[PDB]
Amino acid sequence: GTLSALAVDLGGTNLRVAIVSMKGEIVKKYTQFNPKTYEERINLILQMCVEAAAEAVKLNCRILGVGISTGGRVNPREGIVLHSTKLIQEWNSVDLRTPLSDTLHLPVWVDNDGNCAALAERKFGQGKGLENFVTLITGTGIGGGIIHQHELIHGSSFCAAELGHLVVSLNGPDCSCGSHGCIEAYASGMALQREAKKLHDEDLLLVEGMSVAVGALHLIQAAKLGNAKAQSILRTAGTALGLGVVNILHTMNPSLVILSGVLASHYIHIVKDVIRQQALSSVQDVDVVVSDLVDPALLGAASMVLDYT
Amino acid sequence: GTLSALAVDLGGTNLRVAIVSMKGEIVKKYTQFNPKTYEERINLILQMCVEAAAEAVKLNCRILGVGISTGGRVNPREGIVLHSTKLIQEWNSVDLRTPLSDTLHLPVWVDNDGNCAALAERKFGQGKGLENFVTLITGTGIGGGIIHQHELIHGSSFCAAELGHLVVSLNGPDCSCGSHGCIEAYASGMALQREAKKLHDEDLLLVEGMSVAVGALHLIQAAKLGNAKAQSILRTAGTALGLGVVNILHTMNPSLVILSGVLASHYIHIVKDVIRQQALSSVQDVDVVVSDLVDPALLGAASMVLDYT
Ligand SMILES: CC(=O)N[C@H]1[C@@H](O)[C@H](O)[C@@H](CO)O[C@@H]1O
Ligand SMILES: CC(=O)N[C@H]1[C@@H](O)[C@H](O)[C@@H](CO)O[C@@H]1O
Ligand SMILES: [Ca+2]
Ligand SMILES: [Ca+2]
Ligand SMILES: [Cl-]
Ligand SMILES: [Cl-]
Ligand SMILES: [Zn+2]
Ligand SMILES: [Zn+2]
Numbered sequence: 215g216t217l218s219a220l221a222v223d224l225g226g227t228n229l230r231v232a233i234v235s236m237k238g239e240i241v242k243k244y245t246q247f248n249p250k251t252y253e254e255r256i257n258l259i260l261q262m263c264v265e266a267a268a269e270a271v272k273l274n275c276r277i278l279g280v281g282i283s284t285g286g287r288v289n290p291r292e293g294i295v296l297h298s299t300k301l302i303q304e305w306n307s308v309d310l311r312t313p314l315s316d317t318l319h320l321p322v323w324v325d326n327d328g329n330c331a332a333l334a335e336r337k338f339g340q341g342k343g344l345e346n347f348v349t350l351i352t353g354t355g356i357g358g359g360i361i362h363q364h365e366l367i368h369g370s371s372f373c374a375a376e377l378g379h380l381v382v383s384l385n386g387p388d389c390s391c392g393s394h395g396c397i398e399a400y401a402s403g404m405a406l407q408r409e410a411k412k413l414h415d416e417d418l419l420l421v422e423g424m425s426v427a428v429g430a431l432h433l434i435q436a437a438k439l440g441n442a443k444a445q446s447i448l449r450t451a452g453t454a455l456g457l458g459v460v461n462i463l464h465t466m467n468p469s470l471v472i473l474s475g476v477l478a479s480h481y482i483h484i485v486k487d488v489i490r491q492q493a494l495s496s497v498q499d500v501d502v503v504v505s506d507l508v509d510p511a512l513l514g515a516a517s518m519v520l521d522y523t
Numbered sequence: 524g525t526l527s528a529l530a531v532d533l534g535g536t537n538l539r540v541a542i543v544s545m546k547g548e549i550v551k552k553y554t555q556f557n558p559k560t561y562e563e564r565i566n567l568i569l570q571m572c573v574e575a576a577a578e579a580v581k582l583n584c585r586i587l588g589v590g591i592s593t594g595g596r597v598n599p600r601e602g603i604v605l606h607s608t609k610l611i612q613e614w615n616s617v618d619l620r621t622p623l624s625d626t627l628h629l630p631v632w633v634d635n636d637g638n639c640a641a642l643a644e645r646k647f648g649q650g651k652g653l654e655n656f657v658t659l660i661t662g663t664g665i666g667g668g669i670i671h672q673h674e675l676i677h678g679s680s681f682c683a684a685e686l687g688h689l690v691v692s693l694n695g696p697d698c699s700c701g702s703h704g705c706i707e708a709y710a711s712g713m714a715l716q717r718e719a720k721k722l723h724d725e726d727l728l729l730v731e732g733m734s735v736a737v738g739a740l741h742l743i744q745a746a747k748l749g750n751a752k753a754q755s756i757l758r759t760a761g762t763a764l765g766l767g768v769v770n771i772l773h774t775m776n777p778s779l780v781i782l783s784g785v786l787a788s789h790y791i792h793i794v795k796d797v798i799r800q801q802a803l804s805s806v807q808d809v810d811v812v813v814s815d816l817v818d819p820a821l822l823g824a825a826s827m828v829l830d831y832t
Contacts, residue, residue, distance in 0.1 A: 287805045297804050346679055360774070362671065369776020370655055373805035376773040381766045381801070382704075383692055384759070393801040395691075395766075450693070457690045457704075464685040465669070465774050467678020492690070492702040495606050496596045496682035 215276030216241075219519035220266055220320070222259060223327060223512045224248055224284040226301040226354025226404065229255070230509075231262040233270050233277070234516035238338040240509065241275055242266070252304035260317050267318055279321045279519035280314055283330035283511040285355060287372050293324045296372060299391045301355050301404075323518035327351065328375055329366055330514030332359025335472050337517045339507045348468045350377055350459070351510055352475035355390070356398040360466060378402065380458040400454035403477065406430035409447050418443050434480055452481045456488025463489065463497040474505035524585030525550075528828035529575055529629070531568060532636060532821045533557055533593040535610040535663025535713065538564070539818075540571040542579050542586070543825035547647040549818065550584055551575070561613035569626050576627055588630045588828035589623055592639035592820040594664060596681050602633045605681060608700045610664050610713075632827035636660065637684055638675055639823030641668025644781050646826045648816045657777045659686055659768070660819055661784035664699070665707040669775060687711065689767040709763035712786065715739035718756050727752050743789055761790045765797025772798065772806040783814035 217236040222229070229248040233241040244262055249255045263280060270277050286298035286305055293311025311322045325333070331351040335341035341349070345364055351357040358377025360367040367374045383395030387405070391398070399405055410428040413419035413436075419428060422439040426432070436444035459471055473482055482504050490498065507513055526545040531538070538557040542550040553571055558564045572589060579586050595607035595614055602620025620631045634642070640660040644650035650658070654673055660666040667686025669676040676683045692704030696714070700707070708714055719737040722728035722745075728737060731748040735741070745753035768780055782791055791813050799807065816822055 287803070299803075362676065367671065367775065370778040371776055371805050371808060373772070373803055374774065374776035376776075376803060379773045379803060380770050382690060384762060384766065391803060393769075453693060457693065460702075461689050461770050462774065463682070464688045465683065465771065466676065467680055467683035467685075469679040494596070494608075494682055494685060494688060494700060496680050499680060 215270065215274045218270060218275040218277055219516040220263055220270070220277050220280040221512045221516040222263065222280065222282045223509070223515060224282070224302065225327065225511070226285060229258060229262070230512055231266050232512050232516070233266055233273065233275050234513065235275070236520055238513055238516070240512070241273060242269060243512070248302065250303055252308070255304070256313060260313065263314065263318055277320060278523040279323065280318060281515035281518040282310055282314070282322065282324040283327040283515040284324065285327055285357070288324055288326045289372050290323065290325045290368070293322055295324070299355070301390055321523060323522065325518065326357070326375070327511040328357025328359040328377065329368070330359070330518070331357060331474060331510035332361050332366060332514065333517045334507055334510040334514035335505065336361055337521065338513055339505055339510070340472055340503055341470065344470055346466070346468045347470040347472060348377070348462050348466060349472040349474060349505070349510070350455075352402060352473070352477040352481070354402060354404050356402050357511070362466065377458060377462065380461050382454050382457040382461070397454050397458035401451040401477070401481065403430050406433050406447075406451060406477070409433060413443055430477060448480070449484065452484030453488055455481050456485040457492070459485050459502070460489060460493045463493050463500055467497060468500065470501045470503065472503055472505050474507065474510045478504045524579065524583045527579060527584040527586055528825040529572055529579070529586050529589040530821045530825040531572065531589065531591045532818070532824060533591070533611065534636065534820070535594060538567060538571070539821055540575050541821050541825070542575055542582065542584050543822065544584070545829055547822055547825070549821070550582060551578060552821070557611065559612055561617070564613070565622060569622065572623065572627055586629060587832040588632065589627060590824035590827040591619055591623070591631065591633040592636040592824040593633065594636055594666070597633055597635045598681050599632065599634045599677070602631055604633070608664070610699055630832060632831065634827065635666070635684070636820040637666025637668040637686065638677070639668070639827070640666060640783060640819035641670050641675060641823065642826045643816055643819040643823035644814065645670055646830065647822055648814055648819070649781055649812055650779065653779055655775070655777045656779040656781060657686070657771050657775060658781040658783060658814070658819070659764075661711060661782070661786040661790070663711060663713050665711050666820070671775065686767060686771065689770050691763050691766040691770070706763050706767035710760040710786070710790065712739050715742050715760060715786070718742060722752055739786060757789070758793065761793030762797055764790050765794040766801070768794050768811070769798060769802045772802050772809055776806060777809065779810045779812065781812055781814050783816065783819045787813045
């Protein structure tokens with residue numbers, strides 16, 4: 215069969231399992247909601263992976279291993295999810311390697327989803343060949359990944375690159391991590407949904423000519439079509455993300471910042487604006503781009519298998 | 524003569540030149556104000572260094588080289604100050620190596636003052652032997668230095684570890700760098716002086732039993748003696764610094780954060796508090812300490828000579 219990985223991505227909303235080729239083509243992708251409880255979650259992960267493994271044979275793909283992208287702090291050497299924010303409940307001190315390798319008879323790699331995104335950008339994307347770069351992946355939450363001297367920074371306790379929890383206010387909105395003023399609390403999908411559902415609750419989102427559960431994409435559309443509450447909300451959100459980027463520049467001084475997720479296209483202009491208004495002159499040459507990868511986290515999970523098997 | 528370095532530290536207020544032994548003893552230190560213009564500054568640096576070099580002979584110290592700690596973005600490989608905030612005016616595109624080595628007939632090393640502080644903590648202080656750690660040096664401004672895999676991070680454009688310009692507000696106080704909401708703008712010496720001079724302007728600083736130009740140390744004393752405007756100001760300042768630390772933890776995840784400068788003792792408790800209230804569980808084991816070094820920047824400048832000559 216063709217040389218492939220099984221990739222899993224456990225997100226703040228959806229659980230996705232894919233067969234991914236050596237070249238970074240998604241051969242087939244399965245999607246379910248990410249269950250809210252451990253027992254259900256682990257069982258569905260195994261179920262999905264067994265099915266995908268069986269389909270891979272039918273599609274003439276040879277699976278070399280399983281890579282797992284997950285929210286949370288992860289010890290990749292051991293394949294253990296250490297601690298999760300409430301975006302994934304019941305996801306603490308979880309050994310993923312043992313049940314998956316026992317069931318599938320494959321080697322298993324695990325890392326944080328932002329770290330995986332970085333790995334995808336390094337193998338398939340705009341980070342290829344760069345000694346240094348940072349990625350922020352916007353989704354349900356905001357993930358980060360930091361590449362320095364060509365390699366990930368995991369930190370002294372596997373908590374480096376938790377860039378969604380860069381703080382840019384003394385107060386702000388509460389974050390699901392339990393803090394307040396985190397860029398995730400301003401600019402994530404979950405943040406913008408919550409703010410779109412607010413407006414729509416007080417009949418203040420819909421305008422001009424939208425049809426119509428409110429979400430991020432509706433807030434963006436209201437603003438494009440002149441909704442001033444929605445424009446204000448999005449500016450504040452983008453400013454906060456831009457300031458998180460400023461903190462990254464002044465900390466790591468990467469050559470490149472890659473924004474990914476569907477919201478990346480919507481924030482890149484304001485992020486660039488905030489850098490130009492506020493950051494030091496010596497970081498103004500930083501390249502800030504939108505990712506050209508469909509699904510960094512899933513591709514990154516596959517990349518662990520493809521590079522290390 | 525005993526094995527020594529000449530060390531220079533160009534700060535936001537004072538220019539200091541010292542003879543420093545191999546063991547990190549300051550043999551003799553000269554202090555002048557840092558002139559506000561280039562021509563005066565360069566001439567005084569040379570003057571001071573020639574005098575110190577002459578005294579070193581009399582004190583039976585053998586000078587191996589000159590190390591320079593300066594505010595600003597620095598290319599250490601070339602010995603060039605690239606760009607400075609207005610804390611040091613007329614300090615852009617300055618080749619320091621050439622005039623100092625031509626005049627003194629010594630090799631010359633130059634780095635940012637926060638980077639030097641890190642180097643001192645790695646050689647003489649609590650960073651010795653640590654694969655990773657970060658330092659924040661509070662003075663006129665706030666400096667940073669990042670040690671990762673035992674070595675400094677300088678960044679893609681020599682602007683890494685500009686940690687005084689971590690931003691913790693959407694608005695916020697103006698910073699001298701031209702931004703607003705930087706931790707320097709909240710918590711530096713210059714920030715606290717400015718806030719002490721405010722209060723004292725409206726006869727609202729002095730209390731209880733202080734005698735008496737207002738400065739940081741007077742604001743701290745007013746608060747210790749029950750001044751509630753001053754306590755509020757200091758809490759906000761400490762919170763902002765603590766949040767800058769939170770951003771560092773969630774970015775780099777160092778094992779150790781070293782706070783230095785005279786204000787370090789005053790902020791460490793609140794910094795620890797903010798970490799415990801707001802940072803992720805996986806960074807709670809971070810050690811946060813006050814430096815045991817008298818003068819990290821000056822010792823760090825000496826360390827470049829002592830380690831690399
Ligand atoms: C479950 C969990 O802790 N998720 C974190 C973080 O680890 C993720 O990278 C991020 C994006 O999914 O969401 C959240 O910020
Ligand atoms: C002149 C200059 O740009 N100084 C900066 C920074 O580079 C310094 O490290 C810091 C502390 O002195 O002050 C300021 O934040
Ligand atoms: Ca991460
Ligand atoms: Ca620095
Ligand atoms: Cl919950
Ligand atoms: Cl000025
Ligand atoms: Zn948070
Ligand atoms: Zn600033």
